[PDB]
Paper text:
Here, we have linked one of the most common protein–protein interaction events, homodimerisation, to an essential trace metal, copper, through engineering green fluorescent protein. Using only canonical amino acids we engineered sfGFP so that its spectral properties change on homodimerisation in a copper-dependent manner. By incorporating a cysteine at residue 148 together with a mutation that stabilises the dimer interface, we engineered sfGFP to switch to a highly fluorescent “on” dimeric state. Structures of the monomeric and dimeric GFP-diS2 suggest that charge switching is through peptide bond flipping and the formation of a buried organised water network around the chromophore that spans the interface region.
In mGFP-diS2, H148C has a major impact on the local organisation of the structure that directly impacts the interactions with the CRO. The backbone of residues 147–149 is twisted compared to sfGFPWT resulting in a register shift of S147 and C148. The change in position of C148 results in the loss of the H-bond to the CRO and becomes solvent exposed, therefore making it amenable to forming a disulphide bond. S147 now points towards the chromophore with the OH groups within H-bonding distance of each other. The new potential H-bond between CRO and S147 does not however appear to compensate for the H148C mutation in terms of promoting the phenolate chromophore form. Indeed, compared to wt sfGFP, the water network is less extensive around the phenol group for mGFP-diS2, with the sole water present potentially undergoing dynamic exchange with the bulk solvent via the channel shown in Fig. 3b. The side chain orientation of E222 and thus its interaction with S205, a critical interaction involved in proton shuttling that promotes the CRO–O− form, is also altered in mGFP-diS2; as a result, the distance between E222 and S203 increased to 3.7 Å (from 3.0 Å in sfGFP). Thus, the cumulation of these structural changes is likely to promote CRO–OH on the introduction of the H148C mutation. The V206F mutation does not have any significant impact on the local structure of sfGFP with both backbone and side-chain configurations of the mutated residue and surrounding residues being similar.
Residue numbers in the entry:
A (entry chain A), B (entry chain A): 1 to 64, 68 to 233
The structure:
């Protein structure tokens, strides 16, 4: 219906480009695949194009396109992410690993022709040489509870903070606290939502034929927490 | 693909019939609407046909069709609920309200012609006259974390136990512990899954034009927790 909305009615090609620096360990990640917003479905394959990924793949999942969330019909007015398209939005995080380092991400999510591009810069500091992150001690999997989206009245966008619990091999848990702010890139009307949340299921596999350090990622996202409308 | 699966590829009409007895308070509920398994989407309207519902609508949500879960393609072998169709399955629960009473449900979920029918008997006992349930002190809303499905090797079906946290008006929480066992009605092959879970978003509203005690229910369900396949 809305012009932003209209860009997402089919299957859309995704490109993700991440340049990272964690404690001076430089790397790049490239992802390719597609988003089906009607089904809230993401299929992507990520490659560490620089060799060995110096952090665990799961710590990068949230950083590596919430415009592909399935908003139920009655909640469509609360979908900031698609309203910002095609011009797109800046997404910034601080991710705080408990008793370990901090990631700071600046990404732009926008249309470049036919393709939805998530282009990221990641800077990690004060990582332990043999913590769960630099010492790769995290299980190859991922889950989250509800992620709460709130309006940023001030800067005309959205904010979110949420806790990711990563399984450690010794059977312990590594907390990664996410604070997120998103601002539109363009000056065109956007939708500022009421409080609601996104529910994400995540599936991380391996292509048995891929030799490069990679992640196969399948995701389902559904927005909830608002009944008004209906 | 599978013959059970094939019954759910479109929009299917649902009828739900509940006869209840809580502490001698007899009531019936009738629900009508549709399930779209491809989208994991349920739309139903429930009527208390006997007058005032003597328990809160949210305590009945889990009792009032997990065959409408969206199983991702790679997880289709782990979908017991549709394998049992058309003949269907018996679903039994004990729901234990913390410091209050207990529900016992026996339902049959099966095809009757074109329609998926959930026909239930509910028996509630040892309810407090002025607890959160008989004294209607629960907020008109509903959420759950993951519901874990496990095979019942013994009786050729599935089992689940899960905790529902109902919001109370004083700002407290009422726990309802669910133990679930499902057995196929027929003797035909069924699929016994590996451990996985269902994630449900729930939206409870009112038809502003309905005078009878009712619940409008919209639900999204997605199965996860298995990456093998893909």
């Amino acid at each position: 219906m809305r012009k932003g909305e209209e860009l997402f009615t089919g299957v859309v090609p995704i490109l993700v480009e991440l340049d990272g620096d964690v404690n001076g360990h430089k790397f790049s990640v490239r992802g390719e695949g597609e988003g089906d917003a009607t089904n809230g479905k993401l299929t992507l394959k990520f490659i560490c194009t620089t060799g060995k990924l110096p952090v665990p793949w799961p710590t990068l999942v949230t950083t590596l396109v919430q415009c592909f969330s399935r908003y139920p019909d009655h909640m469509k007015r609360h979908d900031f992410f698609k309203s910002a398209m095609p011009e797109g939005y800046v997404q910034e995080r601080t991710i705080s690993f408990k008793d370990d380092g901090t990631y700071k991400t600046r990404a732009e999510v926008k249309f470049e022709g036919d393709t939805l591009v998530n282009r990221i810069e990641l800077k990690g500091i004060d990582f332990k040489e043999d913590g769960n992150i630099l010492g790769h001690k995290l299980e190859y999997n991922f889950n989250s509870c509800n992620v709460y989206i709130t309006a940023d009245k001030q800067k005309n966008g959205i904010k979110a903070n949420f806790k990711i619990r990563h399984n450690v091999e010794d059977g312990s848990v590594q907390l990664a606290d996410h604070y997120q702010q998103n601002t539109p890139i363009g000056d065109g009307p956007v939708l500022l939502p009421d409080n609601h949340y996104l529910s994400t299921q995540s599936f991380l596999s391996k292509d048995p034929n891929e030799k490069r350090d990679h992640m196969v990622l399948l995701e389902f996202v559904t927005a909830a927490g608002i009944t008004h409308g209906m």
